[PDB]
Amino acid sequence: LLQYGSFCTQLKRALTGIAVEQDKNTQEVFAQVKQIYKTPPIKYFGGFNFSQILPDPSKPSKRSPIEDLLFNKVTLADAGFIKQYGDCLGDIAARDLICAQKFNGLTVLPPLLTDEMIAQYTSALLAGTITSGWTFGAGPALQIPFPMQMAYRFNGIGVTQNVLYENQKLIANQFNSAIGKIQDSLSSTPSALGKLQDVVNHNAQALNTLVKQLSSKFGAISSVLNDILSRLDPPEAEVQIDRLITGRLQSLQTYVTQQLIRAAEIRASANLAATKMSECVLGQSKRVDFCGKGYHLMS
Amino acid sequence: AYRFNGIGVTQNVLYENQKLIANQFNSAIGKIQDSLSSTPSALGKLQDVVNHNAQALNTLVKQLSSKFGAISSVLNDILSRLDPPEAEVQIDRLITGRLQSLQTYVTQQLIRAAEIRASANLAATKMSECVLGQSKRVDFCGKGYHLMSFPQSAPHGVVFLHVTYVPAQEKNFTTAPAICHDGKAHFPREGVFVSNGTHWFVTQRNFYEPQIITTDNTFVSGNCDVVIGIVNNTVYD
Amino acid sequence: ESNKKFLPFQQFGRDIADTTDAVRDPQTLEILDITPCSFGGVSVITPGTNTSNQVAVLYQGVNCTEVQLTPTWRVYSTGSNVFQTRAGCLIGAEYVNNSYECDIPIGAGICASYQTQSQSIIAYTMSLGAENSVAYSNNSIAIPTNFTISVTTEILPVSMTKTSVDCTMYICGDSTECSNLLLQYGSFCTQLKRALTGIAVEQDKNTQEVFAQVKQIYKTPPIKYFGGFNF
Ligand SMILES: *[C@@H]1O[C@H](CO)[C@@H](O[C@@H]2O[C@H](CO)[C@@H](O)[C@H](O)[C@H]2NC(C)=O)[C@H](O)[C@H]1NC(C)=O
Ligand SMILES: *[C@@H]1O[C@H](CO)[C@@H](O[C@@H]2O[C@H](CO)[C@@H](O)[C@H](O)[C@H]2NC(C)=O)[C@H](O)[C@H]1NC(C)=O
Ligand SMILES: *[C@@H]1O[C@H](CO)[C@@H](O[C@@H]2O[C@H](CO)[C@@H](O)[C@H](O)[C@H]2NC(C)=O)[C@H](O)[C@H]1NC(C)=O
Ligand SMILES: *[C@@H]1O[C@H](CO)[C@@H](O[C@@H]2O[C@H](CO)[C@@H](O)[C@H](O)[C@H]2NC(C)=O)[C@H](O)[C@H]1NC(C)=O
Ligand SMILES: *[C@@H]1O[C@H](CO)[C@@H](O)[C@H](O)[C@H]1NC(C)=O
Ligand SMILES: *[C@@H]1O[C@H](CO)[C@@H](O)[C@H](O)[C@H]1NC(C)=O
Ligand SMILES: *[C@@H]1O[C@H](CO)[C@@H](O)[C@H](O)[C@H]1NC(C)=O
Ligand SMILES: *[C@@H]1O[C@H](CO)[C@@H](O)[C@H](O)[C@H]1NC(C)=O
Ligand SMILES: *[C@@H]1O[C@H](CO)[C@@H](O)[C@H](O)[C@H]1NC(C)=O
Ligand SMILES: *[C@@H]1O[C@H](CO)[C@@H](O)[C@H](O)[C@H]1NC(C)=O
């Protein structure tokens, strides 16, 4: 194999580039603000109930109930943790695909940012947008009562403030009911989070196909190198080894190309998500159907 | 002044602070050259394209010295050392390897071209929306409230200079949603009610400029028994 | 030792990749399981060679207690240089208790840097940002009293280099037999030329679309006075 050029250096370079791009995507999406704001100890906002989205201090992970439901809904195969060689050597007579992948040179790297840091970023964004409105996205954060912010948003969509000030209780009750229905809607629907599951399914399928490809003959007498070496005369074994080498190189190149295309698509999706976070959360948008259906208020 | 009116500030704010604004703009422009020169890795995105192209071409050239399972990497040696019907089995290996290298190079170039096209589309949209007009999209033409932008050309790319307005030196105040007077509720037309401790004024949004509360800058449109947190005072005519 | 229940007529055991993992001893009818010997990947963390020649080593996916090795060199562990992260085992760096901005990424929230403390290599947990807390009240507001004009820069790539390739010169050079042999391999080179030409045209299209918004060439007035603004 040493005399077939530098294909493997190119493969390693492409994989490293994809790995770096993933962390860049996450950082660009989730690190808009550099200040960690905290919610006030007293939770009164004019009758608006935000308990379903604020972090829950009782549980160790400090996640909101909706985030807990979301994390329980999606099933993950490998998290990049230490799938230690000690775990694979345990020989529990139940051989999973992870050990087979690991025994053939295929590994998974952990992301730079943990889930706790992402939760902290989300909590900071929520606290800022609840206590300051849209001021903290353009400079220093300025305090303001929540109903006044809501009236300002109604003025933004083209309705006078007395409409809000004379219907505060009804609006608060409607918002509370709408928030309450979200958890039931998410739980009842079985295929709500299909987009997130598709990525995991695609990655697992690609790795399994790559592992399964090792049992092909590619026109040789056997798919095992040791059998060829032990059964054949040394100058005659190269013509059989070359076929296997070429087939495996072709499989690796196909895998790398597919990974590159999928990475480009994921990068486009991440850019869209970052734009949505900048425009619908840190401000009020007038673009039609960009931050929901209807007249946008907040997100 | 028209741009300040666009971001939500009255014109007299500019007309009474023309010299200060001009000096601030001049200093901000002057600092740009020093900031660009001092930073060594400011223009990394533009250098990455050149580095990638050079590396790809160098790899393609270096690939010509591989044997691909043949007896030599030079065609002349094979032709001069081997019997003519036996030389094809050696030439074919080299041909196939070089074809594979070319195909790999072409695929990589296509993917990079797609990425560059996406970047160029974004740059064209930014040029249309931030330079030829004033944008209200948050964080699209800089950080802060957008005023205007200037383009400059660079090797294989463009540079945008965004000018933005940032508030500073804030102060606390006491506020109320409405003012009660003669059994009637008054709401501000534009701005917010503010109290310094004894009196009540009405001010605008992003700049502190108190005014006497009057029927000229308020509308009544209601009664004084349903608004929560109302404060009663006097309204002049 | 093997816990598998081989049938009396079976002699071998295979896995998904179709390689042997269970065997039966020819002399004593006993089942044995075969596992690969320990292995892993190694990464090197260093500052620039212009700064120092010190390095740190990261063994990926390896528990710190399981470290004739394939690499001849060995980095020997002292009392304090060994650290365990969810990304592997780190040797040659000291874990400090402070937090800074990330300098060299390592793993799950762990970064490394070169610090003067005697200069050394330290490892830490990255800091998200400065702590803050805004006071919230339902009868209080904050209003700015001054402003600042700021100027920022943004860099965007537009186009890249346009290249062309000659198949016959690259693959066969001046040989005629090679060209005759290549002539019967189809029309791959026509496709290659078409793709390269398309990319070359697209580059010029990108530049034209970016830089040709207006069709009138305006000129600045000879007198440069704009109310005190210096351009
Ligand atoms: C905000 O909503 C939550 C959930 O609807 C309320 O929590 C409920 O409180 C009642 C009375 O204390 C309990 O019987 C329920 O079991 C709680 N539900 C959950 C899911 O914990 C909460 O009280 C609301 N906020 C306020 C201020 O009333
Ligand atoms: C709040 O603002 C009002 C309006 O300017 C202040 O009242 C003035 O105070 C000055 C200073 O003594 C007097 O010369 C003026 O005659 C007052 N105005 C009127 C209409 O009488 C008031 O002092 C301010 N309060 C605080 C705490 O600064
Ligand atoms: C708003 O900020 C500007 C700039 O920070 C202030 O202008 C400065 O004022 C001080 C005090 O007179 C001078 O010593 C500086 O030379 C000024 N700077 C410039 C660039 O002119 C301005 O005073 C502030 N506004 C208020 C009302 O205090
Ligand atoms: C606009 O700014 C430039 C640069 O800050 C000014 O040019 C300077 O002018 C002074 C006095 O003529 C010279 O001593 C400097 O050497 C010049 N700097 C450079 C870089 O050439 C220019 O004068 C300013 N415009 C006006 C109208 O004053
Ligand atoms: C406003 O008051 C709060 C609480 O007293 C304080 O934290 C804040 O610094 C004050 N704002 C200014 C601009 O002084
Ligand atoms: C004005 O407000 C005060 C304080 O709440 C209240 O005692 C008084 O009754 C109000 N005036 C009228 C005419 O209701
Ligand atoms: C093979 O020979 C050895 C030594 O003579 C003996 O211990 C063993 O049981 C034999 N095995 C069989 C299968 O005959
Ligand atoms: C590493 O080995 C020690 C030794 O007993 C063990 O306690 C620890 O759980 C191991 N760590 C992992 C991640 O397997
Ligand atoms: C690091 O700081 C934490 C903060 O309380 C402390 O509990 C811990 O003991 C410190 N560790 C060392 C090694 O000093
Ligand atoms: C908000 O208003 C309520 C009135 O129900 C009051 O009890 C509370 O103290 C107010 N918030 C603050 C921060 O004073």
Any atom of ligand 2 within 6 Å of the Cβ of B198: yes
Q: Do B170 and A134 touch (CB under 8 A)?
A: no
Instruction: State both tokens at C56.
Output: 């740190």
B168 lines ligand 5 (CB under 6 A): no
- CB-based pocket (< 6 A), ligand 3: B 20, 23; C 146
Which two three-digit tokens encode residue A23? 């962390």
Q: What are phi and psi of A161, to 5 degrees?
A: -75, -30
Annotate A238-259 with DSSP letters as a single string: HHHHHHHHHHHHHHHHHHHHHH
Handedness of CA A16, A17, A18, A21 (dihedral sign): positive
Beta strands in C55-168 (DSSP E): 56-60, 82-85, 88-91, 94-95, 104-105, 110-115, 120-125, 130-131, 140-157
d(CA C1, CA B174): 80
Is the separation of the CB atoms in B223 and A162 below 8 Å? no
Among candidate residues C134, B137, B9, the one with its CA nearest the CA of residue A129 = C134
User: What number of other Cβ atoms are within 10 A of residue A262's Cβ?
Assistant: 15
Distance of alpha carbon B129 from alpha carbon B121, whole angstroms: 12
Phi then psi for residue C91, to 5 deg, are: -125, 130
CB contact under 8 A, C145 and B169: yes
Distance of CA A159 to the CA centre of its chain: 38
Q: How far is the CA of B28 from the centre of ligand 4 (A)?
A: 15
Between helix B84-126 and helix B44-62 the angle, nearest 10°, is 170
Report the alpha-carbon distance of residue C206 to residue C220 in Å, rounded.
28
Q: What are phi and psi of C228, to 5 degrees?
A: 100, 0
User: Cα-flanking dihedrals φ and ψ of residue A166, to 5°?
Assistant: -95, 0
DSSP lists the bridge partners of residue B193 as: B202
Token digits of residue B237: 């005519």
Q: Which residues contact A121 (CB under 8 A, 6 or more apart)?
A: A30, A31, C128
CB of B199 closer than 6 A to ligand 2? yes
Alpha-carbon distance of B12 to B18, in angstroms, equals: 10
B95 alpha-carbon distance from chain centroid: 49
Q: Is the dihedral of CA C193, C194, C198, C201 positive or negative?
A: positive
Looking up tokens 């290249």, which residue turns up?
Answer: C163
3-state secondary structure at position B154: strand
Quote the CA–CA distance of C50 and C118 in Å, as a whole number: 17
- Round to whole Å and give the CA distance between B142 and C152: 7
How many residues would you count in chain C?
Answer: 231
Percent helix / strand / coil, chain B, rounded to 5: 45, 20, 30
**Residue B145 in tokens:** 């409230």
Q: Determine the Cα–Cα distance for residues C67 and C64; give it in Å rounded to an integer.
A: 6
DSSP for A96-113, please give it: -HHHHHHTTT---PPPSS
Distance CA C211, CA B153 (A): 9
- Residue A289 neighbours by CB under 8 Å, 6+ apart: none
Q: Does A82 touch chain C (CB under 8 A)?
A: yes
Taking residue A182's Cβ as centre, other Cβ atoms within 10 Å add up to 13
Please tell me the experimental approach by which this structure was elucidated: cryo-EM
Sign of CA dihedral A129, A134, A139, A144: negative
**A136 min Cα distance to partner chain C (Å):** 10
| Residues B167 and A140: beta-carbon distance below 8 Å | yes
Resolution of the PDB structure in angstroms:
2.5
Residue C142: what are its φ and ψ, rounded to 5°? -125, 135
Window B:105-164, CB contacts with C under 8 Å? 105-106, 109-110, 112-113, 116-117, 119-124, 126-128, 132, 142-144, 147, 153-154, 156-164
Nearest CA to ligand 4 atom 27: C230
The rounded Å distance from CA B231 to ligand 6 centre is: 8
| Residue A42 CB burial class (10 angstroms; 0-12, 13-18, ≥19) | exposed
CB–CB of B202/B211 below 8 Å?
yes
Give the Å distances, CA to CA, from B40 to B35, C108, C112, C115, C151: 10, 29, 22, 21, 20
- Interhelix angle A234-276/A194-212, rounded to 10 degrees, is 170
Is C195 strand, coil or helix? helix
